[PDB]
Amino acid sequence: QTLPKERRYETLSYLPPLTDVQIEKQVQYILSQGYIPAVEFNEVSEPTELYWTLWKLPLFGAKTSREVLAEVQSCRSQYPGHYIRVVGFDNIKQCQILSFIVHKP
Amino acid sequence: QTLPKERRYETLSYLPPLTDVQIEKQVQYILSQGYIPAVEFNEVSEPTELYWTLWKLPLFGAKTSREVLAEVQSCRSQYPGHYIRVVGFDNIKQCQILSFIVHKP
Amino acid sequence: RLTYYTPDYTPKDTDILAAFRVTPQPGVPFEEAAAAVAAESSTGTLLTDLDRYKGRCYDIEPVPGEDNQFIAYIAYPLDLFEEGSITNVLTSIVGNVFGFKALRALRLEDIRFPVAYIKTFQGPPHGIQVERDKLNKYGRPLLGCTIKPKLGLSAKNYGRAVYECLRGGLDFTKDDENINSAPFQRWRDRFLFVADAITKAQAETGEIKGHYLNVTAPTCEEMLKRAEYAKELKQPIIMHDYLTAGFTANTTLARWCRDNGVLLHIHRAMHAVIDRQKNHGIHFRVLAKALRLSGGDHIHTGTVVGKLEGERGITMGFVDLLRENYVEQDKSRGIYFTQDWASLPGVMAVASGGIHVWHMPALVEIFGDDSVLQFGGGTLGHPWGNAPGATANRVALEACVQARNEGRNLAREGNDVIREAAKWSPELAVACEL
Amino acid sequence: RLTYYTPDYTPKDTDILAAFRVTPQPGVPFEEAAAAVAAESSTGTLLTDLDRYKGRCYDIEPVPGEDNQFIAYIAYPLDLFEEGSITNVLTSIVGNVFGFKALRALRLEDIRFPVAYIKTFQGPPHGIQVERDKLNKYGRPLLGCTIKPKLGLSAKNYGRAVYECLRGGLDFTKDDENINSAPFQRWRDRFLFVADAITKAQAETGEIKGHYLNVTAPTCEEMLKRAEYAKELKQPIIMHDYLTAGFTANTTLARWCRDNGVLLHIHRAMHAVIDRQKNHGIHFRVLAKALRLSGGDHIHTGTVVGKLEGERGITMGFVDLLRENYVEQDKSRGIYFTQDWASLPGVMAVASGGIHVWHMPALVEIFGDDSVLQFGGGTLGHPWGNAPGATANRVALEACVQARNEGRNLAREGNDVIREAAKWSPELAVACEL
Amino acid sequence: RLTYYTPDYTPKDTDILAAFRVTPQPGVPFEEAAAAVAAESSTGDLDRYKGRCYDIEPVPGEDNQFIAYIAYPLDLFEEGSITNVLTSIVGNVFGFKALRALRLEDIRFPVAYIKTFQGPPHGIQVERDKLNKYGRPLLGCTIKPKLGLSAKNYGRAVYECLRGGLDFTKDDENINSAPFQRWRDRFLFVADAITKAQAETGEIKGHYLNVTAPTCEEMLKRAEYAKELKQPIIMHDYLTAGFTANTTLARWCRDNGVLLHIHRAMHAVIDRQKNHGIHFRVLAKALRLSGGDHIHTGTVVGKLEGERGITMGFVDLLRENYVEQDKSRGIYFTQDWASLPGVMAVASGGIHVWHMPALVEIFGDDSVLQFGGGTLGHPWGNAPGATANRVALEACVQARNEGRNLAREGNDVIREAAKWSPELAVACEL
């Protein structure tokens, strides 16, 4: 048996396609470390192309609640043909704590 | 009479399209010299693109037996739209002893 | 002597402290050997002022559980050493003092480069943060094969084993220690047939794949023409064996990679000559701090899985020294001096033991996000080749990254997430048994 | 004299042996002329030590069947010659010794560069293996036209005859001896209108086509600005007439092509001044070994088809010297010294006689896979042009490559596979008669 | 074929004539091989770019051999490249199979093609102006032993020869650099032996520092170092290193004021045989068109009338501006050098004290005389052995500057200089 030529995308791509319960349980790691999470959309996932466009904000309303999870489904209804992400942000270390695709075209 | 603009591919391309008996008799040169035969597949045959993807393993029959085209027919049923090769390998001289296309899309 | 043993000397915030592990010859008392390791690393045994440039031992602290051994904390001043020269730290401190004959063994355990002296260096070319920003790889420890077999592979067969590993989710791929150039495989051709195999595997799967091209070379001219060629193949990363090639060639390539945007993978070849014996040599947390001050975005910190609690607290000691901004003095965890790095960029800590699939719970729990996990060093590959062998080493990563990011204690619930990821991956299920 | 004739001297594994073919003047005995060819190539006729730097004849071995001729094996030491200088081998060995007047003719047959002295050289820029890995052309002898007419063609009409040959399956295409630059065809324009004709024929048919751009030039500055331009057209291969331009300019371009990834086609122009007479000069297996030590990935070894059994055993002697790692002492096959090349890369052996379609059984059987087959030198082209003329020279290749890889003895079953490939190729059937 | 033998082609003044010495196979007629030595040295248009034969002239005194005058056009060849003349003319013509032995005797570079070249860096006149050495043939030791001498003991033997009135001192062929003597240290301890031997005796002393190297980068950094020792002259083995490295070094030595001593190492692979090869009068023209302020022309003393007619044949070709077509002296074409600078003719055989009357008469002022070639040294060393070769030089130049016939009154002027010189009187016999 072999390995197929399959294009893979980001830091959780070598998995089954992430359902909604998992992403609710995924962002609950992001915002529980004091981090501000976000949603980033893009047309293609290119190695050259290293910015993806931020969706409305790095949204945040409280210490821990459903913030991102409702906003992704609003972006699935807005952009059903863009690579949607969920990214974290740290401000002390000043890099992203996650970057993974929740939705593909 | 002229020469047509025909794109040709590799080291046995200027021939009739190689049938199955010929390739079995072709690999019987490869493995009889103690060499390691293999199968390599690719989407396009580009001069820039100088690697083709190794199918499963660099195969070997016992000292001489038919495991190569028998697997190519499994790769013709797996990938009927890729440029399939059969390549040899030497370990002493350390280069390929053949590189020729058995199957085109 | 005993003018170099000032036990009341509270060391300044700009001294360059050093904690030796002196094992003196018998009859030599502890203060007089600790004044001696402060002697012949300065102001050896008036024409100047002695009291301004002398190394001063300021504390003894006998090692618990073992007589004839102590930890001579030496306090070298700032203006003894060169701005920006980590080969003048070692020429001053471990230069003339280990072969001192009143000592049976002398081990430089730790060293405190002050904030005043860290700022003369460059740090890494790119930190943890800027390395992840260049590679666009966030929130996971990165990966690597090591191309087996080492010797004998021609440069294209070498790049086919690189392209095969770099398809299946692997981030990096290491070039070996004993591969710089050799009559079967020259570097100009090894770098060429690896750039043709990165841009095939980077264009196939859209991640920024890289390869630690070995620019360790006989001369510093041949090193920089070996790195300027990996710049002109647009390679993201080179590597360099920094203890065979030294700290003058490393700091040359530090300054080069910062001025050319190439990541630098520092490999700790010939490290075990000097950090492996527990009584004599230079502990690697000196040599870890020494290349965080010179270049390197990655350094091999070995492994954790084959070591005890005390031998991995010391290994997680110097992983924090090269990766965290401020590290508190904790001697059970190995660190002797509190070390402010003054916002110097971090270095990745690379895990490169004899490790495989079943160690992804361990090395994502121990080494955090800010790490690289090599493979293929001791473990015997994979039955289906390299590209199913690398996808086994990548699905087992992101299963253990997903598990860690859901509260699942990988110390206890770690072997569950390997087994429940081997179901959804056929490449990992055949790697699940060996 | 007879202090330079030490017949008991077992030569060391680090001596630089040399086997002359001395034809002495009459009355000069054999030992005293063989001590003399060991004399004036060293230590000429107590200020130093003689016995450490002297050339020593150590065996005579009279040539069978011809009196007044013998094979003086001279044993020069290692530390007489320069590291890396094949123009100091010839200045030492064949420098001052052929014009010696006690000798009617003197022929340097063979020479044994030891493993100690091969390692100072570079070898070829790219071997057999790395040349095939750069060109991605495995398991067949490669090809070449030669653009006729030599003289008169403007640089674009020259590149149209290149593009026409490079369509029909031809791998390379040779630029001529007497074309470097000339008022009808400058090199800057010849290289430009050939790069525009390679990248048309390489993009059309997906093989890495090349052209032996002639960088032989008046000065070494004008040579390297002629090769650095073929580097910046991204050309795979240049060529160089190494005996007119010498071994200082060849070793300059050796070191350049290794440091720039260009293949080097060494052409043996002006070779027949010195290797063609059977009694005097420098046999080409010296000049074959001399450019395997300096640069070249290809060298013309002429042809086999017009020569006897004894005249092709000698030609397959020096084909093995420049292409195989270890070659045993076989004097019927021409080689006088066993030659370990110490894993130095091979050189292609190029076949460039007056050869055509019907010689593809012969030159794939004699010259193996590791070869290049030129064409168009003596034979009168093709009636349908160059692109059906090159497809005739390529279908006849891969018929004879397919036949050799199926057990079919091309010595006996060779003319069958030309005739049964002329059926499936209309371009070859019209070339089947002349 | 037989369109390459055009016997009515009176050759143009811009052609590049070449006079081969064909020895064809038995059965090959002379018109067909002469059209064939003109064939594969071209075009293997045709009316404008073929090398064509225009005369046969069989060798007198010998059958089965002739002198095929080939007339190559000018625009076939590269402006300023003598490695394209030898690639074009003698590239693929000596290996032609219907020829038992093919020898390039002479060649005529026209005025049209000599002007593309540089010529020597410095001529006879410009070299002697730089050295301030007038009206006498110059001198030379060759430092014996060749090998073994460390860089200072080599320099001490250079200082010892150059004290005794010797003008130059040659570095050997096989001394480029070697683990007993590196060039950086040979050049240092020689330039420290010249500034002592030039300060002792005020004459401009020089040493032919061997810059022959493996690469052209290692040759110019070996010559840029002899420039920055303020050395007057370097040397270059010009046939092992080739005509691309000489023309690289010619263009350098003209553009850095260094004289160039071209050594004819490996010359006798390609001209010792009288029927096959490239005769040295081609190779002497070939390095006058690349650079050289000196060239070894061997010796005259061990040669008969014909073998020194030929030796004085190319000595005039590399030193005189215009040389008439004189086939008995060996020169096959009238060569107009178009005011190109001359090259010295360096006599270097087994010559000694007593050959000074001949070699001031045979080789004129415009010559260099090397010593130590075959002779068994001097019994008192180097500095007497060079003063012997300098008194016996200037005793022969004194007699030549007084009208004394040095063919007959030559042995007298050595013996009447052995009285007023003690170092000469012991080299007077051995």
SS (H, E, C) chain A: CCCCCCCCCCCCCCCCCCCHHHHHHHHHHHHHHCCEEECEEECCCCCCCCCCEECCCCCCCCCCCCCCHHHHHHHHHHCCCCEEEEEEECCCCCCCCCEEEEECC
Residues C300/C315, Cβ–Cβ less than 8 Å: no
In three-state form (DSSP H/G/I as H, E/B as E, the rest C), the secondary structure along chain D is CCCCECCCCCCCCCCEEEEEEEEECCCCCHHHHHHHHCCCCCCCCCCCCHHHHCCEEEECCECCCCCCCECCEEEECHHHCCCCCHHHHHHHHCCCCCCCCCEEEEEEEEEECCHHHHCCCCCCCCCCHHHHHHHCCCCCCEEEEECCCCCCCCHHHHHHHHHHHHHCCCCEEECCCCCCCECCECHHHHHHHHHHHHHHHHHHCCCCCCCEEECCCCCHHHHHHHHHHHHHCCCCEEEEECCCCHHHHHHHHHHHHHCCCCEEEEECCCCHHHHCCCCCEECHHHHHHHHHHCCCCEEECCCCCCCCCHHHHCHHHHHHHCCCCEECCCCCCCCCCCEECCCCCCCEEEECCCCCHHHCCHHHHCCCCCEEEECCCCCCCCCCCCHHHHHHHHHHHHHHHHHHCCCCCCCCCHHHHHHCCCCCCHHHHCCCCC
Element (H, E) at C319: helix C315-321
Residues 6 or more apart whose Cβ sits within 8 Å of residue C321: C285, C288, C289, C292, C327, C335, C339
Neighbours of C23 (CB within 10 A): 18
Give residues with Cβ within 8 angstroms of E75, minimum separation 6.
Answer: D182, D183, D184, E48, E49
Alpha-carbon span A69 to A27, nearest angstrom? 8
How far apart CA E241 and CA D334 sit, in angstroms, is 27
* Contacting residues of A for C136, CB less than 8 Å apart: 47, 50, 99
**Three-state DSSP class for residue E166:** coil
Structural domain span for residue A48: 1-105
Among C156, C184, C188, beta carbon nearest to D258: C188
Furthest-apart CA atoms within chain D: distance in Å: 78
In chain E, the largest separation of any two C-alpha atoms, in whole Å, equals: 73
Whether chain E has a CB inside 8 Å of the CB on D98: the answer is yes
Amino acid of residue D314: I
Calculate the alpha carbon distances from B81 to B44, B52, C131 in Å: 10, 14, 38
Helix (H) or strand (E) run with residue C21 in it: strand C16-24
Residue A94 neighbours by CB distance under 10 Å: 10
Residues C138, C140, C146, CA angle at the centre, nearest 5°? 115
- Dihedral sign for Cα C25, C27, C31, C33, please: negative
D267 belongs to the catalytic site: yes
How many of the other CB atoms lie within 10 Å of CB of C119? 15
- Chain D, window 131-150: residues with a beta carbon less than 8 angstroms from a chain E beta carbon: 148-150
Please choose, from the candidates E308, E306, E271, the residue with its C-alpha nearest in 3D space to the C-alpha of residue E286: E271
Per-residue DSSP letter, B36: E
In angstroms, rounded to a whole number, what is the distance separating the alpha carbons of residues C96 and C284?
A: 19
Please answer whether residues B36 and C160 qualify as being in contact, where contact means their C-beta atoms are separated by less than 8 angstroms. Answer: no
Q: How many CB pairs under 8 A join D and E?
A: 266
D273 contacts E270? CB cut-off 8 A: yes
CA nearest neighbour of E225 among E190, E196, E197: E190
Residues of D in contact with C156 (CB under 8 A): 130, 133
Distance of CA C87 to the CA centre of its chain: 17
* Residue E16 token pair: 């590049």
B92 interfaces chain C, CB cutoff of 8 Å: no
Note whether C214 and C187 are within 8 A (CB): yes
Which one-letter DSSP state was computed for residue B33?
Answer: G
Query: What are E322-330's contacts with CB under 8 Å, separation 24+?
Result: E330/E105, E330/E106, E330/E279, E330/E281
C200 touches chain B (CB under 8 A): yes
Q: Does E45 touch chain D (CB under 8 A)?
A: yes
Nearest CA in chain C to D131: C189
- CA separation for the pair D302, D318 (Å, rounded): 11
Burial string for C51-90 (b: 16+ CB within 10 Å, else e) reads: eeebbbbbbbeeeeeeeebbbbbbbbbbebbeebbbbbbb
DSSP-derived 3-state class of residue C23: strand
Q: Each residue of E265-286: b (16+ CB within 10 Å) or e?
A: bbbbbbbbbebbbbbbbbbbbb
The C-alpha atoms of residue C103 and residue C32 are separated, in whole angstroms, by 11
* E strand or H helix at C298: strand C298-300
Q: Do the beta carbons of residue E203 and residue E177 sit within 8 Å?
A: no
Structure tokens given for D182: 């000339």
Feature table: binding site of E for substrate = 92, 142, 146, 264, 296, 348
Q: Using what technique was this structure determined?
A: cryo-EM
* E319 touches E347 (CB < 8 A): no
Parallel, antiparallel or unpaired: strands C339-340 and E138-142:
unpaired
Closest by CA position to D175, among listed D189, D162, D188: D162
Which residues 399-428 of E are in CB contact (within 8 Å) with D?
A: none
- The CB density around residue E111, as the number of other CB atoms within 10 Å, is 14
Between CA D290 and CA D117 the distance in angstroms is 12
- Of the listed D148, D231, D307, D331, which one is catalytic? D148
Query: Cβ distance C274 to C287 under 8 Å?
Result: yes
Strand spans (E) along E62-130: 69-72, 99-108
Fill in the amino acid letter for D304. V
H or E element in which residue C400 lies:
helix C387-404
Give the angle subtended at the CA of A32 by the CAs of A27 and A35, to the nearest 5°: 80
Token look-up 């160089």 returns D240
Distances (CA, A) of C347 to C138, C303, C366, D434: 15, 16, 16, 71
Q: How remote is the C-alpha of D165 from its chain's centroid?
A: 23
- The domains found in chain D, sorted by start residue, are 1-121 (3.30.70.150), 122-434 (3.20.20.110)
Give yes or no for C197 touching B (CB within 8 A).
Answer: yes
Query: E152, E205, E207, E263: which is the annotated catalytic residue?
Result: E263
Specify whether the CB–CB gap between D40 and D124 falls below 8 A: no
Report the sign of the C-alpha dihedral through residues C294, C295, C297, C299, in that order.
negative
Backbone angles phi, psi at E130, to 5 degrees: -70, -35
In contact, D233 and D191? CB cutoff 8 Å: yes
In 3-state terms, what secondary structure has residue B58?
A: coil
Run of H or E including C225: helix C220-232
SS3 B103: strand
The structure tokens listed for E119 are 């010529």
Q: How far is CA A13 from the centre of its chain?
A: 11
Residue C365 neighbours by CB under 8 Å, 6+ apart: C400, C404, C410, C411, C414
Round to whole Å and give the CA distance between D81 and D14: 12
- Cβ contacts of residue D89 below 8 Å, gap of 6+? D16, D81, D111, D113, D290
Residues 6+ apart with CB under 8 A from D349: D298, D299, D301, D319, D322, D323, D367, D370, D371, D372
| Distance of alpha carbon C191 from alpha carbon C234, whole angstroms | 11
Largest CA distance in chain C: 78
Tally of CB atoms within 10 A around B44: 11
Q: How far apart are CA D356 and CA D376, in angstroms?
A: 8
Distance from the Cα of residue E36 to its chain's centroid: 31
* D326: alpha, beta or left? (left if phi > 0; alpha if psi -120 to 50): beta
Query: Which strands form E367-371's sheet, in the order they lie side by side?
Result: E168-170, E138-142, E367-371, E345-347
In residues, how long is chain E? Answer: 430
- In eight-state DSSP terms, residue E26 is T
* Residue C333 exposed, middle or buried by CB count within 10 Å (0-12, 13-18, 19+): middle
Phi, psi (5° rounding) for residue B103?
A: -155, 135
| Alpha carbons E246 and D248: distance in angstroms, whole number | 9
Q: What angle do CA C362, C365, C367 make, to 5 degrees?
A: 95
Q: Which residues of chain A neighbour B43 with C-beta distances below 8 Å?
A: 5
Query: Using CA of residue E113, residue E114, residue E115, residue E118, what is the dihedral sign?
Result: positive
Residue in B with minimal Cα distance to C199: B49
Residue A57 CA to residue E330 CA, distance in Å, equals: 96
Of B51, B56, B91, the CB nearest to C384: B56
Specify the DSSP class assigned to residue E76: G
Q: Do A5 and B43 touch (CB under 8 A)?
A: yes
Contact: A2, B56; criterion CB under 8 Å: yes
Dist. CA A105–CA A90, nearest whole Å: 28
Give the tokens for residue D48: 């130093």
Kindly state whether C398 is in contact with chain A, defined as any CB-CB distance less than 8 angstroms: yes
Beta-carbon-side half-sphere exposure of residue E339 (alpha carbons within 13 Å): 0
Contact C24, C33 (CB under 8 A): yes
Q: How far, in Å, CA of A9 to CA of A86, rounded? A: 13
E244 chain-D contacts, CB cut-off 8 A: 216-220, 223, 245-246, 248-249
Q: Are E152 and E184 in contact (CB under 8 A)?
A: no
Element (H, E) at C327: strand C326-327
Interfacial residues of B (vs A; Cβ cutoff 8 Å): 43, 53, 55-56
CATH code of the domain covering residue A99? 3.30.190.10
Give me the number of domains chain A comprises: 1
Tokens at residue D345, please? 């890369």
Q: How far is CA B36 from CA B24, B63, B84, C193, C369, in A?
A: 14, 10, 17, 21, 41
CA C118 to each of CA C14, C74, C113, C289: distance values in angstroms, whole numbers, following the listed order: 10, 18, 6, 10
* D157 near E CB under 8 A: no
Say if residue C352 carries a ligand binding annotation: yes
Distance of CA A60 to the CA centre of its chain: 15
Distance CA E137, CA E229 (A): 26
What DSSP string runs through C127-188? -SHHHHHHHT--SS-EEEEE-SS-SS--HHHHHHHHHHHHHTT--EEE--SS-S-BTTB-HH
Q: What is the spatial distance between Cα D48 and Cα D43, in angstroms, rounded to a whole number?
A: 10
Distance CA C200, CA D88 (A): 45
- Residue D411: burial class (beta carbons within 10 Å; 0-12, 13-18, 19+): exposed
Could you give the maximum distance between any two Cα atoms of chain A, in Å?
49
Rounded CA gap, A87 and D64, in Å?
86
* Whether D and A touch (3+ CB pairs < 8 Å), yes or no: no
Which DSSP helix (H) or strand (E) runs through C349?
Answer: strand C348-351
Q: Which residues is E323 bridged to in the sheet?
A: E335
Q: Is C306 on the interface with B (CB under 8 A)?
A: no
Whether C267 sits among the annotated catalytic residues: the reply is: yes
Q: What are phi and psi of E62, to 5 degrees?
A: -160, 135
- Considering only CB atoms, which chain D residues are within 8 Å of E43? 149-151
Token pair 């064509």 in the structure block, residue: E52
Which amino acid, E395?
A
Kindly report the CA angle at E286 between D219 and D266, in degrees rounded to 5? 50
CA angle, corner D238, sides to D234 and D239, nearest 5? 175
Question: Hunting for tokens 């500095």 — which residue is that?
Answer: E383
The verdict on a CB contact (< 8 Å) between B56 and A5 is no
- What is the rounded CA–CA span in Å between residue C177 and residue C377? 12
DSSP bridge partners of D212 = D174
Please identify which residue in the block is written with the tokens 């002493």: B92
User: Binding site for Mg(2+), residues of D?
Assistant: 174, 176-177
The token duo for A38 is 């976000």
Chain B residues whose CB is inside 8 A of the C154 CB are 94-95
Distance (Å, rounded) from C-alpha A100 to C-alpha A13? 7
Name the residue type at position D26.
Answer: P
D232 — contact with chain C (CB < 8 Å)? no
- With the C-alpha atoms ordered E396, E402, E406, E411, is the resulting torsion angle positive or negative? negative
In this structure, what token pair is assigned to residue C231? 């710049």
Q: Cβ distance B88 to B38 under 8 Å? A: yes
Amino acid at E63: D
Q: Which of D399, D395, D400 is nearest to D431 (CA)?
A: D395
Cβ-contact D69, D63 below 8 angstroms: yes
- Is the CB of residue E207 less than 8 Å from the CB of residue E183? no
Query: Rounded to an integer, what distance in angstroms lies between the CA atom of residue C82 and that of residue C88?
Result: 6
Distance of alpha carbon D151 from alpha carbon D158, whole angstroms: 10
Contact in structure between A12 and C401 (CB atoms under 8 Å): yes
Question: Which stretches of C15-140 are DSSP H helices?
Answer: 30-37, 50-53, 86-93, 115-118, 129-135
Collapse the DSSP code of E75 into the 3-class scheme (helix H, G, I; strand E, B; otherwise coil) and give the result. helix
Phi, psi of E358 (to 5 degrees): -75, -50
For the four alpha carbons of C396, C401, C403 and C404, in that order, the dihedral sign comes to positive
Tokens 């980068």 correspond to what residue?
E217
DSSP H or E run through E284:
helix E280-289
Check contact D-B (3+ Cβ pairs < 8 Å): yes
